[PDB]
Amino acid sequence: SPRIVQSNDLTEAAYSLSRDQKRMLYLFVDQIRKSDGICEIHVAKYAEIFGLTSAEASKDIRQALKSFAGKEVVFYYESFPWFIKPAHSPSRGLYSVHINPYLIPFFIGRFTQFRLSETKEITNPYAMRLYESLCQYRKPDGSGIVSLKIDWIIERYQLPQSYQRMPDFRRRFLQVCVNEINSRTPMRLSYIEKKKGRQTTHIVFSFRDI
DNA sequence: CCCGGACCTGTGACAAATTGCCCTCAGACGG
DNA sequence: GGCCGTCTGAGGGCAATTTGTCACAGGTCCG
Ligand SMILES: [Mg+2]
């Protein structure tokens, strides 16, 4: 299945995209990299890749696409929009999109790589972003270890504001995304909390390959 | 000594959002 | 050439789960 690669600058960028948007984003990077910024998506190809019907695919593409308008990307700073023109459909089952051409160099650069079958069953988008940031440190054999700062997690994954109270952070973000990865990917993940006084400051992740 | 206050934790409620499903009907194409 | 049956996909919806928010009880330490 397709091998995604992207600059580490994209893995660690600050942005908020949905699952459907992130899925499409994987195909743009694949299309662009296999070569002006104009990409294309076929309904019937999307449906076969992610095991959806044509009807629900059409809905996913359509609603994801109109929700890109106004979205921005921050590299740590400098902010850019994803699209510089609305999408449009010349043919039935076919959509044409205009990626901000200034984003091209950020896609292809110190890089991150994973096969698309590894992430395509994940549902929660924060769990996608986390799996991407563990892959950035993975070793050939499939293991690694990394410490991420909690304030840095919140800015980069653009977690919603109420998750600045740590018990909500634990309950609705951390536990679920550790759970999904262990249930939906070929990776076995564990973690431990680093404290300073009463405050929890970092999260320390360990993983291997099954 | 014990207090209110400033921190921290987990859980129960409710509100807001998303998931995979279902149903209709016209477009595009090949037979 | 030209009509129709079939495969697509662009819409309209649902209930069951997931995600996002906050009140409230109960731990610590300090002045
Ligand atoms: Mg869908």
Distance A91 CA to B24 C1' (A): 22
Please check whether residue A7 is in contact with residue A75, taking contact to mean a CB–CB distance below 8 angstroms.
no
From ligand 1's centre to the CA of A50, what distance in Å? 10
Tell me whether residue A207 is exposed, middle or buried, using C-beta atoms within 10 angstroms of its C-beta: 0 to 12, 13 to 18, 19 or more. buried
Q: How far is residue A53 from each of residues A60, A176, A196, measured CA to CA in Å?
A: 11, 27, 50
Cβ-Cβ contacts under 8 Å for A96 (sequence gap 6 or more): A38, A39, A40, A87, A88, A89, A90
Cα(A174)–Cα(A188) distance, integer angstroms: 15
Name the residue with tokens 């959806």.
Answer: A52
Distance A154 CA to C20 C1' (A): 15
Q: State the structure-solving technique.
A: X-ray
Name the residue with tokens 């459909």.
Answer: A89
Tell me whether residue A168 is exposed, middle or buried, using C-beta atoms within 10 angstroms of its C-beta: 0 to 12, 13 to 18, 19 or more. middle
User: Exposure string (b/e) for A21-48, b if CB count within 10 Å is 16 or more?
Assistant: bbbbbbbbbbebeeeeeebebebeebbe
Please check whether residue A39 is in contact with residue A27, taking contact to mean a CB–CB distance below 8 angstroms.
yes
Q: At what angle do helices A125-135 and A175-184 cross, to 10 degrees?
A: 70
H helices of A12-82, in order, are 19-33, 43-50, 54-66
Name the residue with tokens 């990917």.
Answer: A185
Cβ-Cβ contacts under 8 Å for A3 (sequence gap 6 or more): A113, A114, A115, A116
Please check whether residue A132 is in contact with residue A11, taking contact to mean a CB–CB distance below 8 angstroms.
yes
Q: Please give the structure tokens belonging to residue A85.
A: 């023109």
Closest CA to A201 of A165, A164, A160, A151: A151
Cα(A143)–Cα(A189) distance, integer angstroms: 10
* Closest residue to C22 (CA, C1′): A162
Residues with CB under 5 A from ligand 1 (ion): A 56, 60
Centre a 10 Å sphere on the Cβ of residue A201 and count the other Cβ atoms it contains. Answer: 13
Q: Resolution for this model in angstroms, one decimal place?
A: 3.2
